[PDB]
Amino acid sequence: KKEYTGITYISGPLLFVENAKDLAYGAIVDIKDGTGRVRGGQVIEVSEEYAVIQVFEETTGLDLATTSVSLVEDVARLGVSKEMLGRRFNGIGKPIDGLPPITPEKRLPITGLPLNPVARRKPEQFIQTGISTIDVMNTLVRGQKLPIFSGSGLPANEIAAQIARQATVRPDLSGEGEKEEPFAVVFAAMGITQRELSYFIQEFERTGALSRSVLFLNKADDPTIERILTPRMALTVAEYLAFEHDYHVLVILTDMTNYCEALREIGAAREEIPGRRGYPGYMYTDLATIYERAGVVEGKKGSVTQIPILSMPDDDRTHPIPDLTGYITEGQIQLSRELHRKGIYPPIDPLPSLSRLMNNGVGKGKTREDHKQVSDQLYSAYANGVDIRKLVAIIGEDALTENDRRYLQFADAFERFFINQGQQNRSIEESLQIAWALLSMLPQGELKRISKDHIGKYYG
Amino acid sequence: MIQGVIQKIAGPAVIAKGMLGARMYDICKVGEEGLVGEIIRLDGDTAFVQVYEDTSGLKVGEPVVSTGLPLAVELGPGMLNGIYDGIQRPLERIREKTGIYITRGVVVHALDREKKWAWTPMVKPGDEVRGGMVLGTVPEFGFTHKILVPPDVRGRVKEVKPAGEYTVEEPVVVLEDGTELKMYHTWPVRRARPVQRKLDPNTPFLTGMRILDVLFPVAMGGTAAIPGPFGSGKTVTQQSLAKWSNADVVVYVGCGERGNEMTDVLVEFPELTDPKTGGPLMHRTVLIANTSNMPVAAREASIYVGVTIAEYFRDQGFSVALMADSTSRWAEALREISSRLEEMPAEEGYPPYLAARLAAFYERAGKVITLGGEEGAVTIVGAVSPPGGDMSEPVTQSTLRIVGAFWRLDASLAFRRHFPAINWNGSYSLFTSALDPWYRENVAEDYPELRDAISELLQREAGLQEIVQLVGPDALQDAERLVIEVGRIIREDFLQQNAYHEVDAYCSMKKAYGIMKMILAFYKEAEAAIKRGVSIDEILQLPVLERIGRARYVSEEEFPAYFEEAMKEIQGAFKAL
Amino acid sequence: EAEAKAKALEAQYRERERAETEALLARYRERAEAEAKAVREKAMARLDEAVALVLKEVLP
Amino acid sequence: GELLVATARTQARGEVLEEVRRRVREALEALPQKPEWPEVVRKLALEALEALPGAKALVANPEDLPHLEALARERGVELQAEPALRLGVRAVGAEGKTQVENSLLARLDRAWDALSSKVAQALWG
């Protein structure tokens, strides 16, 4: 309707329009060139002097005598419906399936109003994955937003695929009867290349999850600024399907490193003073407003559990992207290169991962009473084995004493018969029995954190 | 055809005013001497042109003529047996009209417009054509270069000329629309030539060298990254991949590079011969040289010219191999223009959209099926040159997230003049899980388990050599020395590809399978006797060790008859015990 | 005897799976076509009323 | 099979909405060549002129230039007769910096989302 012309300046993602009084702050503008092409753009600074618009697509072909700028949606909104569980979307939610769009039940703000911590709830109920490391030591429960770090080329996609296809909350040990509803996957991808895309969609059509899932694909060959909109647009639908229909939404936010590179690009186009390694200061607030739109609320049986996949640049816990992620979120799962050369699938090193809220998930009745002491004894014994490996590499094998060989046999028996597994799905009882098999290698007395009841009931 | 004058000149940048409506990324003839520039940072009524030649000697107030339409190449027949520069104007033409140098601002043609090629039609009047449909064929060298519909052309055919011979711009197909079709057509170098659908990579790009397909293979649609500092080859390896592969066209795009490499490739190719056809190798290699003395802005033209030519040849049923050499200089070109243009730098001057540029580059590769009905694949070998190892640099940890394989060259292992210098661990390929049925049908039956055994023995030697170095090899028990000696057999016998000897410079898969099966039968028959009480120093200079040690220099016409008798010696060598 | 029983059970299970999949696909396609035609008929029955409402919302 | 049934029902609902949208498009086509279309064009021109704050030029069709000519004689606006404007009018305000549209097709494009969100629930039953 009310167009604007008078573009003064165009460079990078930015363009400077003038005499722009009535563009509300943070609105959507479509850019129209000479010949019919229309582009997305978001407003990020308004004055009666001028206004600034970032461009959701490539800035190729814009002249200055044309390319009018037209207004829509004072704040950026997504039309949202429930006829939505089968069709994929681009980086800005145009559907690419050869079908008409959703008939919107509602209109929601894509930014997300911040959740009230009074209206939250303790994330209680255990989720098993099949993977014994997670389901023994680093607990994954309903309502947690735990990221999975990846190294250079470690199979993060296959870990996410296995937790997508074969993770299930177990109602029977929780003691509530059952409703046994399976999950609902919000898979939002930000610059996965083509091969990972092929693997995820073929995995989902082989497990039959595409009748209950949604994909917001923002590929590598897509333009580079709509990555800022993709996770917030996905988590809007996630909030929707959780908190209006009593679901158990699991959200796979793939490869946050491309989100952070796009954020770095939009922060450096506007000259803004960065923190460490060239990332701007508001990256904390934006990763917060992605992550903390997740959790459980009181009374409503909807729920959101997130796996964000990180890619650590120099496979370290110290770079600003995994560092600020691990400061924001609660509990993470880290992969490592050192186990991966030994064929160990899935290559999870079990020291640096930590569940934040294992303590409320497992315990009496819910999992089994042993589980906390069992996990703590495994942590302490395996850490002792790992840091005695370096001393063995210093002083040689024949310079060893008693219990050193027991810790070392514990270490490699652990790393080849607890973490090392195929795509088989181990239960909680099966993984705990394998844990007692590995705890059978140590003589007693050193099993300090396991109390007398468990050591007198389950040794062997 | 907007036309202004030069306001200011700074660096290689010409910022010219009066451009009230010059659209983005146009080619503009800047200066009165026909220089070629790209247009960014529109501002008021004033553009910001970078020039692809130099600019030392221009003035103020010379006219700048925009050409309206953006940076594009001309895809057609005649590209093979060809060198090009960054803006695609071929160098031997310039030698025919300048001399033995390059002058600022010639105006020449990207293709020869006086060569009479041979038409043969494959459509009739009244047909429907959409983009990417087969029109006609031309025999180019050993070839059927099929000229096809440009991908923005759809309509009814009015007439098509018969099988004569023609100039490359001759209007030969006129639609029932007012549209003509020449033998070439233009295309901008910042857009994928669009496909119907992308497939999944299931067939290996047979890289030809022993380690690069035995241990860490690349698929036909896949991408690979080769790091490696100076003195670690990199050019022996690129020229070996250009010589010995199973490509259909090799597009060798070398930017920021020596001149001796380019003239080496142009001297020694028209006598050597690809394994499939006959004739010179040069008739399947289009090479885009950009020597490091040529002006710095041309590199970002050059790389996209290369991948555009790769897509034009993947649209014609050809499994195109592309070698993008020294893309760190392309990253330096981005650094130089972003520091000329006064934006924010991040992580040592590389502008923060370098990951977007590099990802949109590598994502043009893959295995597709084109609109005509052919299949195709384009693969990219990207040679990154990081400064000193130091892999946390932004170019390398940008390209590490978007490659299907990663072949880390070393610096220590290339100081005993081992070649090639592929690291055994820390280099990894993600196509081993998908190339298994093809291997199990087409190299052996038990091929994957065999290299599983080879991989774990390499891992075991790497985990054993450390205590070998620490406590000294005095403390060999019995078997760890046999592990060391099999390690010495492998890195002195199996990974020793010369690339200069005339039968070592190409290896097959069957010969690699034969040598690996020989090594594993050797180890599984010596480990039987090592617990019988044989001295480990006794077992070394048995004469069949020479018979494996120079068992790679036989050809395929010599290898099975030598091979089965060598294993007969492997069996009978321990009956002498 | 165990191998013969395993082969017979696998063949019978594959045949029963193929027949049940054919029957379920036929019932699903029949219900899909019936519900699509019924939804089209019901939408045509409810048609021609709110078009003037949307026009009056459109016209000033 | 359930996904195929849901896709069939979604395609049926979308085809019904597309038929209703084509009927509304034919209604918008017939709305221009009407007898009361000059009074409606004068009403929409008054609405656009009230929407145009401090503008200079208002452009519309030449035959539609009489249909609000008393409105064009009012308010001192530069009445431009552009026959491209089949539906609605345009408004350029005083600088070459701010256009305004009033097209019935542009109003349909602006309101088809709410038309979906309300009238599809209205017409589904």
From Swiss-Prot, chain A:
Single biological process term from Gene Ontology: proton motive force-driven plasma membrane ATP synthesis
HAMAP family: ATP_synth_B_arch
Key words, A-Z: ATP synthesis, Hydrogen ion transport, Ion transport, Transport
GO MF term (any one): ATP binding
NCBIfam families: PRK04196.1
Its biological purpose: Produces ATP from ADP in the presence of a proton gradient across the membrane. The V-type beta chain is a regulatory subunit.
Family designation: Belongs to the ATPase alpha/beta chains family.
Organism: Thermus thermophilus (strain ATCC 27634 / DSM 579 / HB8)
Name of protein: V-type ATP synthase beta chain
UniProtKB/Swiss-Prot annotation, chain B:
Domain of life of the source: Bacteria
Catalytic activity: ATP + H2O + 4 H(+)(in) = ADP + phosphate + 5 H(+)(out)
UniProt KW keywords: ATP synthesis, ATP-binding, Hydrogen ion transport, Ion transport, Nucleotide-binding, Translocase, Transport
Keyword Transport assigned: yes
EC assignment: 7.1.2.2
GO molecular function: ATP binding; proton-transporting ATP synthase activity, rotational mechanism; proton-transporting ATPase activity, rotational mechanism
Record's keyword annotation contains Nucleotide-binding: yes
Binding site for ATP: 228-235
InterPro entries in UniProt: ATP-synt_VA_C (IPR055190), ATP-synth_a_Xtn (IPR031686), ATP_synth_asu-like_sf (IPR023366), ATPase_a/bsu_AS (IPR020003), ATPase_F1/V1/A1_a/bsu_N (IPR004100), ATPase_F1/V1/A1_a/bsu_N_sf (IPR036121), ATPase_F1/V1/A1_a/bsu_nucl-bd (IPR000194), ATPase_F1/V1_b/a_C (IPR024034)
GO CC field: proton-transporting ATP synthase complex
Coiled-coil regions listed in the entry: none
GO terms (BP aspect): proton motive force-driven plasma membrane ATP synthesis
UniProt-listed Pfam families: ATP-synt_ab (PF00006), ATP-synt_ab_N (PF02874), ATP-synt_ab_Xtn (PF16886), ATP-synt_VA_C (PF22919)
The family this protein is said to belong to: Belongs to the ATPase alpha/beta chains family.
Cited PANTHER family: H(+)-TRANSPORTING TWO-SECTOR ATPASE, V-TYPE PROTON ATPASE CATALYTIC SUBUNIT A
Known function: Produces ATP from ADP in the presence of a proton gradient across the membrane. The V-type alpha chain is a catalytic subunit.
HAMAP family the UniProt entry points to: ATP_synth_A_arch
Protein name: V-type ATP synthase alpha chain
Gene: atpA
UniProtKB/Swiss-Prot annotation, chain D:
GO annotations of cellular component type: proton-transporting two-sector ATPase complex, catalytic domain
Entry superkingdom: Bacteria
Protein name: V-type ATP synthase subunit E
Alphabetical UniProt keywords: ATP synthesis, Hydrogen ion transport, Ion transport, Transport
Protein task: Produces ATP from ADP in the presence of a proton gradient across the membrane.
An MF annotation (GO) of this entry: ATP binding
GO biological process, one term: proton motive force-driven plasma membrane ATP synthesis
Keyword Transport on entry: yes
Cysteine disulfide links: none
Family assignment from sequence similarity: Belongs to the V-ATPase E subunit family.
